Design a protein around this ligand. Structure first.
Ligand SMILES: [Mg+2]
Ligand SMILES: [Mg+2]
Ligand SMILES: [Mg+2]
Ligand SMILES: [Mg+2]
Ligand SMILES: [Mg+2]
Ligand SMILES: [Mg+2]
Lengths: 251, 251, 251, 251, 251, 251, 251, 251
């Protein structure tokens, strides 16, 4: 324990599901955390349920709002000191094939899943570089950044852009000695509130033809791999992809 | 010869460089072609230099214009009959790291390199499916869809989105028996007019630490692989990536 | 036509299935060919069925026989002149998991699928370099060099070694200006005699959960991609992997 | 701490370099360990330097000795109880291109780097399955299982086989509910004694064109990622590849 | 009473403030109403507080979502029959001068105040024309569509676009005999929840130099003028502007 | 109904056309009315046709007679109690351009259309202020107070003066807390007897280039807008212009 | 310079304030001018102070004298040739609300501000039409022809009539091809002798709540806009209003 | 002449039509000018045809490109010194009713006609304020910012936003003593290259029912009014609208 001693972390969309589990384990390991979300009653209840205000707080912010990113970092710095860790987790999904995707659907999904991650990654580098913090940016992609799905058109493009954009960021901060690492995490199917939104997807993706283990994962499975990437145990890991999918992409 | 017997092809950005070479070899192999571009004097001169109006014509169209895509297909169908082949080639580049990319730069590059390819891929599936044409959509990505470059931030995201979005399209048309194939092509550094725009990039990317062959490629190197993917010799190839880079990604 | 003008090619295991199709299309495109195999009566009948002795001949040779490789190159050079093209095609498969694979089974498969390809690649570089031939070595891997299968343990290991060993050879001949290219081809499931070793594989791999097109391929699907790699159209392609699998690895 | 509570681990080649660091961190986290090697005086000194005989012991064994693998499991089970974790770490390297590799060199490297890993993986599945141990087999590959190097011919082939063979094992134990996970670790260049086999490799691979961070790693960088894969935090990770290379493969 | 006999109305942003007052008086006068909003708990409570489900219901919808507009009209038609009245009320404000407005602020405000009104006005004409319904589209502009305010830059542009765009719509449906009227409403300062968001604005805008009446208005003041424009008493009014501002624009 | 509960209204020129319709609807909504005119036999018949003497009565008075205005207010107050509402409606028109207007024509039209409205507005403020009546003065202007007509010279000037003079009165009664509101109504072309003064005006102004609806209005179209302005629903409306013209001024 | 080459202009009330400045700039730009006024000693001194008798002269005339208008045109034509330009500038103001305006005050102001402008506009059209002069009539209105003031009752009415009457004249001379243009100028508060009629108006109208620039204008500000309207640069401008008020009417 | 002595002006879209005429007259009056456009051959030819490089130059720039605005001002400052005048002229049109406007058409027109004008107005204020330059921003709206047209939906909204946004800018720079004036110009129909794009619109808009003068204007008609607004003759004019339309809006 205390594998994240002295760290200051922002976690976008950390009030439910995967992000909420990441926040819980981060606090358990010594970090001070700021979770974000769009609904404030859910968000404040989530922060209080994990710990005290000097351990974790909430900040209402839509990841696609460019102006909010500056206020988010200022607030976190004011409460806990300089930020050392960023988890770009907030994202959404659309159940459409490329052929049947409306232009409205296309723009709204990429505004969050791609533009938002770019806004945070870009400002994270500026604020955390050259400060001896052992900085780490963790961008949440997916197995849909490796393989395609016939009814996840815009989502496939979303996560593929994230996959390769982070490699470019990682190289720039390593060649320039910024003391910032960038890595991507690729979950399989995990039981979260948003997966209950796609009816019957859990049973379909628990078949052996899809997930060889015959079942899907839990939010803590993604939390543990991000503790590794946020801690100084991973000080030699940058620009790499980490897959936790129960065998999905192995076949 | 006549490996593309009876085919009807649209090639976006086919008035210079890589696209112009693709158009030349397509006509040489029996196809009827419509090249697009933004400058009309250059475009008409390019079409006439390759062949007669019953072999190839020009259509002024910005790939990021959504309304133009419908008029482009209607014009090509009126001149040559139903379209069977689409090459999503038009793209642009920005010499910026993720840290130093303005939001304006970000939006303009993705409007062409990602939104445009999506507009054509989406409408191509609708117009070419279920017609016995042996249809083929060829999306131009890059080696920057595999590896990152520290000063090609938005470009890396552009080509990564293209890489995985085409896999989703390929699966949807195969599971539904659409008679449409989708594949991506990943060139290395090729001597084109736009590469002279980035000063001294040719000599830098001809070092052995970058391109093991000690030199860069020519536009015909990309033309030949797209004749294969457009012809019926590749009738079992869909959702795959084809790299022609002189060894860049092998090390 | 005559895309392989003036080329001299060795094709191991060219008396059945994929190799016989490669040999057929090579002769049709102007090359002169020497196919190998272990049974000589089938082999002589195979050569005669494709063309006349001044177009194609047969040479009895076990791919795992190290000393025979020198006699194979000497015989082919004597009949047709200096060899310019090598296709390491001969291979076998066993339907066993890693847990239940005997050491005897393990050793015999790697002797053919790995040692044999190494014997040919090593001597091919020595014999074809620095002669202005536009030489090309094509090593036959598989989709099983990309993904795993629970009942193809030793076969998976063989084909993964071929995938990465060819990258090393390709880099060495490019950095040293040898005028030799090395590339790998990765077929999906193809209807050949070798499918009798995997009982029931055609029906099993024709499900949509396996091959999205709902069917498996034919030997000519692999022949056409090897015409491209053997011809000078691919003079900028080295160290790359080319997949023709009907969508198998895209999901 | 005690992230490896109650685990029993075998680490081949755990008397130097990476393996010794894995053994050190395993004991620190609660596991009981048996390290192997060929020289017994160094091995006994190595075990004693890490802890007491009830924490860690040594067993003289050549990874290529098939019969010794059964005695290795019997000895470890007798001292500590049933084995739950296996790290196939022992390996060697040779600085030779494919063109200039002797058959003797080829056979000896694959006997250790490939046959040895196969011997352990095969018997590990048999001995650890269906016992509620939360078993985990970690096979040591490399970045040379992803990209090629012009002077690592046989080493590239070895490590590529390990990469894809482990996927096959992982799928078999997940589809059959064996309670065994299989994953591979791919280190970059790490300062170990084994670097004396590649002369001048530290200075060569510390150029920015090779490792973007401008330096190579230390053995503890690989130890921490193997603690994650050996613990139950990774219970949803199987058949995956984890890269710790300082940015090497991102460009 | 029953001045709106038999009418079916959609009111965007009708769960608070001005829109909520419009909805209340509409139901009181015989109309059947569907109010929209982004927060569903507030929205459902608002609908129930005004009347029964056969008088008024709620529909969660962001006016800037183009796809939602079609579902909004379908839902209202399913519950109450064909829609006859549309009130484009939802809007937001930003306290910035033109000089100090960020591009992010600019785009977000116009996405709601201009794009949203255009989406509803465009689809309203298509759905309500040529059906004998006595249709009426009421677009909510402001006094800031007549005069400027030094710290309401984007808002001034928002409401000015609405003012003149509705004139074009009104003329098109009158020249074509569509039986659809379009008019704009221009409130002064009204005590609503969003006016409490701009601190001290109420006291500042209640000075006689600003509002000659020495006080600001109440939500019912805007409700009554929209009952007139929705009823058949205004059957000769189209393309006109109606100001209720307590004298603001008279001086 | 009873939207004008307890109100006492004077309507000049209420024996024909627009004024008679205003009087009719005023009584229907609870007000008690005194209509004026110059011919007494028509006037008495008009009053009786609308209702009983305790609802509406007639008073012979020329709007340009200054002394008669005091007797008009005294008579109305004696019959119904204190007056709360005034509609300055009486007016006439002449079909002449500025170039060909006689001074006699000029003086007579402004004596009625301007001097008369001034006489009533001035005395209305004096008599109705500071009595808690919710007083409202409605001055009848026209679209000819907004745009010009080449053959309505003197009429244009009259109606433009009314438009801006009422703004001045409205401001004075709001700054001084008089409890009196002043507003103007601007009708388009309405079918009344007064159209005999403009020969052929109905057919001329019913062209689409003039009134977009293709027809002119009826007197009730103006009556309804004056019910709103006379009732307490408009208690926040003062100094404003309300146009009911069938789209005339929108183009 | 000489922007008014060959023009002959009458300027009513050109012996003080705004008119004297218009006369000064007119002569400087080549026009020959006749200024009018009621006091002849001031008028003769004013003419002499601007230039010589062959450039500018004086004519004693009260703008409300109808018969004098014919002698004014005859005198000016005799001295300089046919008149081409008329500026209806003479006007007066009274500081009274509508409620407290005497009928005597009302009649005298409209006799000058309205009847006088009508007398000149009517005869100007008759005398200047159809002579190729490029004629231009400029009627002086005010911001008080746009907005109301609580203590400028009769003045507001005068200036509103001028605003709309000039539109009617402008249309008549354009539809009939008279070669006469009519336009209005609307000044803000300007420092002139006429400000003694509104006591304290300079300090009152220099507050930022009134004139945003914090000061009032000078007579030359109005002279320059009348040079444009009198010259042939404005040959496409007719029936329009030109405001020079320091921002007064923008808020 | 030299009414624009010592001024430095940027004119967007000044290579054709209205802007080209504005540039010509500006140079004639002493200003130094930088015209912008998208086509560089047309643009350079336009600059040279008006004057020498020390009088006028060209700068390729799309007004909708946000990044280009900073480079445009820097270039003009480098060639001529600090900029004092900005003319936001570049705009485009779409021939669609609100009902039949595609979302693509809507976004593209507003990107130029509204976003572009905002980009220049915002940066113009920052660069020209508080420098004693007598700065002037002239925004090109239209008569379609006053009245509507049934087939100019997006254009009507474009010009209405411009009309009211400039009022807000004018007030902010006057209240803060910025020495910057903002005004809008509203042309009628003018014969330009883009008006020949709408076939037969010239004859339709030259009818007396549309333009009372029976003809349309020429580019110089708009040039002259912008010389007035750019010169110090208009130092008291801010936040006002200037119409030159041949009587269009007067009826
Ligand atoms: Mg986008
Ligand atoms: Mg797969
Ligand atoms: Mg690399
Ligand atoms: Mg009009
Ligand atoms: Mg005002
Ligand atoms: Mg917009």
């Amino acid at each position: 324990s205390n594998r994240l001693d002295g760290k200051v972390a922002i976690i976008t969309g950390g009030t439910l599901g995967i992000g909420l589990a990441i926040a819980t384990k981060f606090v358990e390991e010594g970090a001070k955390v700021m979770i974000t979300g769009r609904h404030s009653d859910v968000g404040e209840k989530a922060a209080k349920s994990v710990g005290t205000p000097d351990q974790i707080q909430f900040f209402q912010h839509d990841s696609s709002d460019e102006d909010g990113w500056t206020k988010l970092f200022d607030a976190t710095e004011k409460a806990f000191g300089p930020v050392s860790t960023l988890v770009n987790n907030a994202g959404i999904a659309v159940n459409k094939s490329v052929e049947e995707t409306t232009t409205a659907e296309w723009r709204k999904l990429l505004a969050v899943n791609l533009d938002g991650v770019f806004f945070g990654t870009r400002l994270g580098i500026q604020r955390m570089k050259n400060k001896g913090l052992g900085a780490s940016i963790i961008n949440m992609s997916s197995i849909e950044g490796f393989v395609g799905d016939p009814s996840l058109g815009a989502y496939n493009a979303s996560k593929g852009a994230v996959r390769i954009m982070s490699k470019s960021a990682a190289l720039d901060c390593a060649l320039k000695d910024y003391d910032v690492r960038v890595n991507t995490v690729h979950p399989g199917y995990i039981k979260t509130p948003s997966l209950d939104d796609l009816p019957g997807a859990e049973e379909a993706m628990s078949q052996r033809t899809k997930t060889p283990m015959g079942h899907i994962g839990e939010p803590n499975d993604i939390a543990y791999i991000c503790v590794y990437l946020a801690s100084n145990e991973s000080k030699f890991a940058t620009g790499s992809e980490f897959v936790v999918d129960g065998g999905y992409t192995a076949q």
